Amino acid sequence: QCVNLPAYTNSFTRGVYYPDKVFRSSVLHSTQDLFLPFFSNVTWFHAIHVTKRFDNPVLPFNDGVYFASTEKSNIIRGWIFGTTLDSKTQSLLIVNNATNVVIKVCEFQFCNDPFLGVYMESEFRVYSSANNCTFEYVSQPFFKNLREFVFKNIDGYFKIYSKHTPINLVRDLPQGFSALEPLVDLPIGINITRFQTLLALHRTAGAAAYYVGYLQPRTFLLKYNENGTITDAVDCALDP
């Protein structure tokens, strides 16, 4: 029914992911790819304080997005990816409506302020209309948590890498190292330049925060364990 209604932080060596599915042990592998520049400025958005802050602007999607979110009550529900985000062109909807994971590539007439509602889930005010839908992909029905995602759009494939990590922290991006694992490759085949996060409001925002950084073509030196796991990396353009 389509109802109506900057901060910066550091990326302490975050956003590294597994480049392939081949098992390797005890090796240093050098890779050139789209990575998050180590120690670069991400942008900070939040939703807090019953309403004071509800950050869901339309951000660019340049070559890929690192998306992190520190939350405790599942406010972040998914994203919208597209180029014009209206029914003229095709768009990608990824949403978790508390029961399924819905991945749709349709022609959406999005709301100016899209969100979902919890009163129990009560509202799905995302888009006015869906037409000409090409792709669908669902699942089975159904600050403490840091959830990191890397979104890439290459050769017609939408690649998603993800990692959920338990944290215990008050304010900012946890300084650490964690390698993201391949989540899914979707053959959506669309043109993506902008994106927007889908939040769930209470009927009040709640409390959650997410950070957005942009990937760039970088050279990284990845270190593989004696097991398959990636334990460290080097950003060759960070410093001498």
Place this chain on the structure above:
Amino acid sequence: TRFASVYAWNRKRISNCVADYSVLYNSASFSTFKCYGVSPTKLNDLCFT
């Protein structure tokens, strides 16, 4: 309207022009188009001597 015979073939000089061959997309259909010493996808980005 008229092409030449293969035995006496026609040569035409082309100069001072922009080779925007997408103007042919509306009217022309070519069974053969093979380029030598150049890639077809690079033709939009070159100046020919």
Place this chain on the structure above:
Amino acid sequence: NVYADSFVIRGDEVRQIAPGQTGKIADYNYKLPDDFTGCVIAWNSNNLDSKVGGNYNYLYRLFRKSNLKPFERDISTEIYQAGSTPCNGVEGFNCYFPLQSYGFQPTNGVGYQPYRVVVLSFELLHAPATVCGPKKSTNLVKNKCVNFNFNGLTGTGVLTESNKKFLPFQQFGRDIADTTDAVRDPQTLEILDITP
């Protein structure tokens, strides 16, 4: 990862479905990546896709502001503005509807008859595979010099049982020299070491 892309084009444009081609199809309708792995299959379907009085169901994009990226699909149908004058959703002078219809008649010349194209895309020998060719499997022979074929990976060596544990999305393991030294048996999911 077998994918089947399918469509119908003119016969004269079948050459345009290949890596590194240019033309109305490769530019505005369907582009293949340069590092394409897979197969392109085409065949004349004049007796199916052409009817008397023309068959006008099959469309193609004639105008587009820029070339497509590989494997990108554009189904927008907004007026293409060919001049400086703006088009406000109305076809007119220097304003063209971007899609045009093939005219497929049974007596069209072979260059103008419909051809059904199928492009199969897949990757080879790097990840678990669920589609295979019709080859019968033999019993496993270990501790002996054999020629082997594991999920398409052929070779020669001695097969021995392995201690490695692959994550579920992994099928092969490699060395510093990048040769395959561990494999997972397809019939029984047991890791085996390959030794020269």
